[PDB]
Amino acid sequence: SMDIEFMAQRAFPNPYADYNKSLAEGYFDAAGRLTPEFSQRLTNKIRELLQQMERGLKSADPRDGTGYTGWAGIAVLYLHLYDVFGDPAYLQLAHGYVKQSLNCLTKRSITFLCGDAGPLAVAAVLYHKMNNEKQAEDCITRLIHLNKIDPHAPNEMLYGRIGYIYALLFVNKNFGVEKIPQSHIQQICETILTSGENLARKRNFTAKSPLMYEWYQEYYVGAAHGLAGIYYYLMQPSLQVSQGKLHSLVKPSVDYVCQLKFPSGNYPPCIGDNRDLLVHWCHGAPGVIYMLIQAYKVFREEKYLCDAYQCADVIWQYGLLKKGYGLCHGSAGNAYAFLTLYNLTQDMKYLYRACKFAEWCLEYGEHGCRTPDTPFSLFEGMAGTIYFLADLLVPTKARFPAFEL
Numbered sequence: 001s002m003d004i005e006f007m008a009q010r011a012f013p014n015p016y017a018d019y020n021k022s023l024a025e026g027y028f029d030a031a032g033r034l035t036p037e038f039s040q041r042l043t044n045k046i047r048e049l050l051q052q053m054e055r056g057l058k059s060a061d062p063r064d065g066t067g068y069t070g071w072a073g074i075a076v077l078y079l080h081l082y083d084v085f086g087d088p089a090y091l092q093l094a095h096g097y098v099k100q101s102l103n104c105l106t107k108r109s110i111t112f113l114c115g116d117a118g119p120l121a122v123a124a125v126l127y128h129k130m131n132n133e134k135q136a137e138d139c140i141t142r143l144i145h146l147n148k149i150d151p152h153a154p155n156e157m158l159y160g161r162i163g164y165i166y167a168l169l170f171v172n173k174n175f176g177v178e179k180i181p182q183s184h185i186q187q188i189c190e191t192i193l194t195s196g197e198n199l200a201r202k203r204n205f206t207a208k209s210p211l212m213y214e215w216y217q218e219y220y221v222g223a224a225h226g227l228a229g230i231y232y233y234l235m236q237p238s239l240q241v242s243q244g245k246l247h248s249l250v251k252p253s254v255d256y257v258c259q260l261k262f263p264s265g266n267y268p269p270c271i272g273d274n275r276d277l278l279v280h281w282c283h284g285a286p287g288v289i290y291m292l293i294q295a296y297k298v299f300r301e302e303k304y305l306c307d308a309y310q311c312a313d314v315i316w317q318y319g320l321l322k323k324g325y326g327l328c329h330g331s332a333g334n335a336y337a338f339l340t341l342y343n344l345t346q347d348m349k350y351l352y353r354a355c356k357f358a359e360w361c362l363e364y365g366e367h368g369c370r371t372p373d374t375p376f377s378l379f380e381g382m383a384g385t386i387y388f389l390a391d392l393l394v395p396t397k398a399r400f401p402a403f404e405l
């Protein structure tokens, strides 16, 4: 491309005035409940997009059942719709999509987004929502008996171990009961730790940073294939890291990555990388923030939170992506940043920015954006932009899908 020098080339000049009490009124009240007039627009655009999406999937690859770009992804969207809208046509649609995604298993990856973890974990909860334990319990055992498959697997989101964790947490979250024994989550989380300190020695960070992780011959900073993603998961009460192991091991590793940030506030794609232009959830501030906020939650130190703000100001400035409107690397996925901040801070400035990003999404296709490689997919495509819009309806429950927790 021509746009290789800096963030500003990748992005659109943000045209929206920044928050004040007055402008927020149009979007939400002092309770941060969205004006029905606004929910109405969001919700009309959702119905409108869903039509195009549904027509689009007719020509989508029958072969791909990934969360990331295939049917299981769409199943995910619909289960989230059936939740936000009660409309049982969504639970039907979801059923047809997990049906489809279960003919796509290749037994060759273990993550929610790119491997059999997606179709299985999603089919599990769907079959549950349909009062149908026969298959619910059947998918469970196949999700579990996935473990022994890539024993030398990586650690990150898309192919790594946290990616398989999420699939398990997703099931448990959606049953409420602990259907996957805690010990089985503990199994895998152990080996991700012991392997992150080994790597850290062999390479000699273990002084500068007790833990280290890599994938595809790089140390990945960000959320998709990276440290930020992996640490975020380790600071996660659901994983249960010893209060000591949390301070001894993970805290300084985290701090190492913080130290990594560009002057701009952004974060390098890769360790040693010094091209400052990716504002994606997959690479940069918009994915790094989840770690920062989760760190402020558990260590309660003003620097973590002060970085999150710093993330957000960058995303606010450079998050409207020429890339398009998707979750992995697009305006929708970027907006989720703001919601996560907002849900911690409660500072209405952030719920506002999220809304103003939705304002952009509502002009889907009006900007010159290249259409995504898979135009209707959860993560590169329309299904994701839609996902956000629906999630935004009720901010406090908004979670970046297939990841956030």
Ligand SMILES: N[C@@H](CCC(=O)N[C@@H](CS)C(=O)NCC(=O)O)C(=O)O
Pocket: 278, 280, 282, 283, 323, 328, 329, 371, 372, 373, 374, 380, 381
């Ligand atoms: N397949 C994607 C294109 C992926 C592209 O946006 N690159 C992603 C890969 S996860 C990101 O790493 N961007 C790299 C860059 O912009 O240099 C689509 O067409 O929607």
Ligand SMILES: [Zn+2]
Pocket: 280, 282, 283, 328, 329
């Ligand atoms: Zn990406």
